[PDB]
Structure 1
């Protein structure tokens, strides 16, 4: 039922690869497009389409992730950060936290490609999603794309508090932070959730599984890891593959698919440089170490790796407030209701991503003056020039994203912060011919001195905005930076009466404190009389820092940052000779053709020369449709019907038609 020779191969099941695959199959119908993926098929998989069970996908024993491990680095205090990668069809779209956001207009301009300008990509960004939200800026958001975006069907009350708290810190509340022209802001964060159904909006169901029902000319080859891309006579005409799991040691197996006219790498920013390097694309010197024969000289493959630096800081919440923390804990009685409401209706806690509100930031020069002089020096060259770019982002999660086995029982609200444009640059490289062998690579977290100041400053900022929220009960001190014990900057725990409130009536140890493990939090200043009851506020004292209280936050960040999976770079656009933005030299042409070979293209999110200050999923879709359009013109097909609409039953706004709301 599967033929050996596809017309257009599309390696990878990544969200970008599903874009290229779905769009490409659609343009001709007659054309035969075969997609190859190293992972399980995900059609109608309950653990994928329903949004609220996202954290499970990240477990270490979890099937759907690869968990690459980095070489140890001094900068992380000897820490060896894991760098997880998606391993299911649809890529990370089947796994992601479903945060929605969009990068600055300056970002796409920074690629400085012959194309790829924001002015050109705006319509293409507009073509790939419908916008369930009550849009005000309708000249930018699409309104009838395959992928749906909304606020979900449930809303934790945390968001209003986070907004009233952020607004008091001099951070403006902007209705749309995805406008592409903003630094400071706050918003009720959008999610990749189909509001009309409550399902996750991954690219696979929207592009691949929606096309296959409708059209015969698409082949899905799940569970076949790519080994190598055979190339001869200057054309990339084949791709030998191996099974994803080597279950038959005595007789290893492989298969060689053929592509008549085009080939495409959408394997993600980690796997892809490896696949090029196994084919011999790289430095001959670096490649002889693995014994692979160097076919083409591309030093830039594997270089210029880039991430974001998230780190979580939980704060305990009052007992009376709602959280998803007890669902993922997870109780057998709460969880039953949480599912039962979703099947019965479609609107429940399960039908929402955890994160509820968030704040992009660009520091005031007055507060910028106290940052380390190195970062000031970086700010002048990098951000001084451009107004559009945020330096750092943080949001708020209505629960604890982490291991609940290792934290005290209760309900928490956890702040999430990720640096927007880390200066640091990593690398990656294969060590062995074997597909299965783990690459050695240096993500290079905190490799550059300049990356620390914004991190510390955002912890100092987010703590203050979590201290002004109505929900706040006290920091969880075990998961906060290790301040000296007598410091006034210290992370205080929950009150005694709240300790009784969580402990239950029958506890024999609530306020009992021996060993001084934690310090009780002081009562809030009394509400003013003579104010309107709705305007009264009771508030904790502001905290202040010294050098010894800064070193602690610094060590905290060094010892607890990790990849945010916004990884990109490696194979990237630029001159073959080299450029300032890509010191080792680029490998792609502006038309996404790999240098030195004919017929090979990259659809990965790796393509980007430099960071996009937004969650990476949107650029995945966008780059996937760029490479799709490029393949389209490369085939010589007319600009008429060059647009490649997927089948879908469009639902209107509920007031336009009666069949579309929750």
Structure 2
């Protein structure tokens, strides 16, 4: 219809929870979800975990992502314009992400320094979302929420190889590193996949499609880019306008359709999508809205400021050819793909495709001794942020059974990638609209690495994860092309594939073992009995790793902080109930509200923010949340 009670704008995790919970809470309450991206209901290119890699392809076909490029070349990235993609589909990140189950640490929530957002406070909500389907030796998880969490159809043999190697450098094993209390140790790494169906646990099918199947009070509009929030004379949100996804209107004319909201408007268009809708509605930096010809509804300079992410490095390593990897699946080899697709359809609960192949990893924290070697500028932060926060980790590290890279730019053979990310970076970016027009790309700045304290931890990670690589059974060398530019004579120089392994790739090849060019220093053949010693590094080596970082550091899609929940004189954007200052009947519930980072893959978090905002809206509307939620399609 034209009018409804609640409007959710952006169908990410947070938005899907809000829209679903409230609708199920009261069959009368007419509520509508509006999403720029397409509907994801029963799309095999969503519900199948194994194909997740393809969503980040800039190949002119894929449209499940929008790609936001740095407006200016960053000095700090030795000249590059950082790319930060985000989701453009119902379910948002939930429908396209890597599907790693990680939780933030207890202190991360405490450090929101807001009433109702303690660890204490959110633990029941954390439980309310989870359907934990794997063993653990603690009580910290939920067992009847709508979001399935499991170890997937099949862990890869490299997982336990990685663990054996982690142990050999003294990162301890743990049954569950997602227990809110841990910041140093290594686990078998769970996924958002239903143990029994092998399907991706996406927020849309869990919270929204569940309800639409059983009630008539939840309205879904997809392929609907939300332009702006229509305001009152009093700055009460009265409604919203939306346009077609594509700009394929005759003339390229703007075709707005207005939808009205009796009670509440909710913005859930994500860290990058929310502060644009606010801005072109009139809720932003005054000087900016003025320059674009936008009547100010509320002067909030913090709208689209303090853009926070996790900073990813990907260290790639060649592995033996009898190793199990995703490389040939990712390459598009037609009987490798025909096989896994078939396996999934016949036996999902055992299928390789019922996984992300990211089956092991650690949270890590530096020793006293190691801290000396890291920067003054990092040592400052240590004392400030980490020193007496023993439950906060500095780095992440996982092992992907396969290269997460353009295979069009990788030699033949098998690989593993050490997927790394900085947990609480000091650097900060921002995002601002360039026009009222909802189709024009905004201004954007990653801000990756513009604080010098963010280098030394990542550098420490490269070295650390490499010592794990070198001690794995499967290891057969570093991929020299994608590693730091070490001096060739340095004891820290890379060693690429060994001759035995190369010949197996191309056993009729005319070219294997031709030294002519000296493009790679070969590894010696693998010995089981080898006695291994740490790589020594110099200041020159460190300068190389530092440079490599600048050149190859990336987003982790764990974007937050662009509509911060802090006091307004500190530049914040929302209340402890997430209302937008200077307005009535408008909230932001998504990861934009975070005032500080969380040491975790942020799907868990976006869901928990969604759960908290569903409580805040429920008690404001005089409603109560039903447990359990409506049955989730295809679940046993």
Alignment of 1:370 with 2:399, yes or no, is: no
Q: For the structure 1 residues 204 and 544, does the alpha-carbon distance in structure 2 shift closer, same or farther, using more than 3 Å as the test?
A: same
Match for residue 156 of structure 1?
156
- In 1, are the aligned partners of 2:147 and 2:206 still within 8 Å (CA)? yes
2:505 match: secondary structure = helix
For residues 416 and 156 of structure 1, what CA distance do their matches in structure 2 show? 16
Pairing partner for 1:12 from 10, 13, 18: 10
Match for residue 90 of structure 1?
91
For residues 444 and 502 of structure 1, what CA distance do their matches in structure 2 show? 42
Equivalences for residues 62-211 of structure 1 within 5 A: 62-71=62-71, 72-138=73-139, 140-211=140-211
- In 2, are the aligned partners of 1:144 and 1:650 still within 8 Å (CA)? no
Greater shift, 223-232 or 45-54, is seen at: 223-232
TM-score w.r.t. the length of structure 2 is 0.97
Match for residue 385 of structure 2?
382
Cα RMSD after superposing both structures = 1.4
Equivalences for residues 293-308 of structure 1 within 5 A: 293-308=295-310
Encode CA deviations 1:533-557: one digit per residue, 9 max, x unaligned: xxxx424443111111111111000
Match for residue 242 of structure 2?
241
- In 1, are the aligned partners of 2:205 and 2:632 still within 8 Å (CA)? no
Alignment of 1:228 with 2:212, yes or no, is: no
- In 2, are the aligned partners of 1:316 and 1:494 still within 8 Å (CA)? yes
For residues 495 and 353 of structure 1, what CA distance do their matches in structure 2 show? 28
Pairing partner for 1:604 from 570, 590, 603: 590
TM-score w.r.t. the length of structure 1 is 0.93
Q: For the structure 1 residues 592 and 351, does the alpha-carbon distance in structure 2 shift closer, same or farther, using more than 3 Å as the test?
A: same
What is the Cα deviation at residue 335 of structure 1? 1.0
For residues 256 and 156 of structure 2, what CA distance do their matches in structure 1 show? 50
- In 1, are the aligned partners of 2:310 and 2:556 still within 8 Å (CA)? yes
2:453 match: secondary structure = helix
What is the Cα deviation at residue 644 of structure 1? 5.2
Pairing partner for 1:440 from 443, 452, 471: 443
Displacement over 6 Å in runs of 4+ = none
Match for residue 625 of structure 2?
642
Equivalences for residues 487-526 of structure 1 within 5 A: 487-504=490-507, 506-523=508-525
Match for residue 571 of structure 1?
563
What is the Cα deviation at residue 286 of structure 1? 2.0
- In 2, are the aligned partners of 1:468 and 1:539 still within 8 Å (CA)? no
For residues 541 and 366 of structure 1, what CA distance do their matches in structure 2 show? 18
Pairing partner for 2:33 from 35, 39, 42: 35
Alignment of 1:631 with 2:617, yes or no, is: yes
For residues 506 and 532 of structure 2, what CA distance do their matches in structure 1 show? 24
What is the Cα deviation at residue 161 of structure 1? 0.7
For residues 650 and 432 of structure 1, what CA distance do their matches in structure 2 show? 41
Encode CA deviations 1:574-595: one digit per residue, 9 max, x unaligned: 11111xxxxxx10101111110
Pairing partner for 1:353 from 343, 356, 365: 356
What is the Cα deviation at residue 136 of structure 1? 2.1
Pairing partner for 1:57 from 28, 51, 55: 55
For residues 193 and 154 of structure 2, what CA distance do their matches in structure 1 show? 11
Match for residue 23 of structure 1?
21
For residues 249 and 301 of structure 1, what CA distance do their matches in structure 2 show? 34
For residues 270 and 649 of structure 1, what CA distance do their matches in structure 2 show? 29
Q: For the structure 1 residues 46 and 444, does the alpha-carbon distance in structure 2 shift closer, same or farther, using more than 3 Å as the test?
A: same
Match for residue 393 of structure 1?
396
1:467 match: secondary structure = helix
2:542 match: secondary structure = helix
For residues 318 and 540 of structure 2, what CA distance do their matches in structure 1 show? 25
What is the Cα deviation at residue 496 of structure 1? 1.0
Q: For the structure 1 residues 78 and 353, does the alpha-carbon distance in structure 2 shift closer, same or farther, using more than 3 Å as the test?
A: same
For residues 624 and 541 of structure 1, what CA distance do their matches in structure 2 show? 48
2:598 match: secondary structure = coil
Match for residue 449 of structure 1?
452
1:333 match: secondary structure = helix
Match for residue 613 of structure 1?
599
- In 2, are the aligned partners of 1:23 and 1:645 still within 8 Å (CA)? no
1:275 match: secondary structure = helix
For residues 246 and 443 of structure 1, what CA distance do their matches in structure 2 show? 27
For residues 169 and 36 of structure 2, what CA distance do their matches in structure 1 show? 47
What is the Cα deviation at residue 297 of structure 1? 1.2
For residues 626 and 480 of structure 1, what CA distance do their matches in structure 2 show? 43
Match for residue 548 of structure 1?
540
- In 2, are the aligned partners of 1:284 and 1:293 still within 8 Å (CA)? no
Unaligned residue ranges in structure 1 (runs of 5+): 528-536, 579-584, 652-658
Alignment of 1:341 with 2:343, yes or no, is: yes
What is the Cα deviation at residue 389 of structure 1? 0.4
Alignment of 1:421 with 2:386, yes or no, is: no
What is the Cα deviation at residue 377 of structure 1? 1.4
Alignment of 1:309 with 2:311, yes or no, is: yes
Equivalences for residues 397-408 of structure 1 within 5 A: 397-408=400-411
For residues 263 and 629 of structure 2, what CA distance do their matches in structure 1 show? 23
Encode CA deviations 1:492-548: one digit per residue, 9 max, x unaligned: 0111121111112x1111111111111111345x66xxxxxxxxx424443111111
What is the Cα deviation at residue 175 of structure 1? 1.0
Q: For the structure 1 residues 606 and 358, does the alpha-carbon distance in structure 2 shift closer, same or farther, using more than 3 Å as the test?
A: same
For residues 8 and 285 of structure 1, what CA distance do their matches in structure 2 show? 31
2:578 match: secondary structure = coil
For residues 405 and 368 of structure 1, what CA distance do their matches in structure 2 show? 39
- In 1, are the aligned partners of 2:22 and 2:625 still within 8 Å (CA)? no
Pairing partner for 1:561 from 553, 556, 567: 553
2:20 match: secondary structure = helix
Encode CA deviations 1:26-66: one digit per residue, 9 max, x unaligned: 11111101111111111110000000000001101321000
What is the Cα deviation at residue 349 of structure 1? 1.5
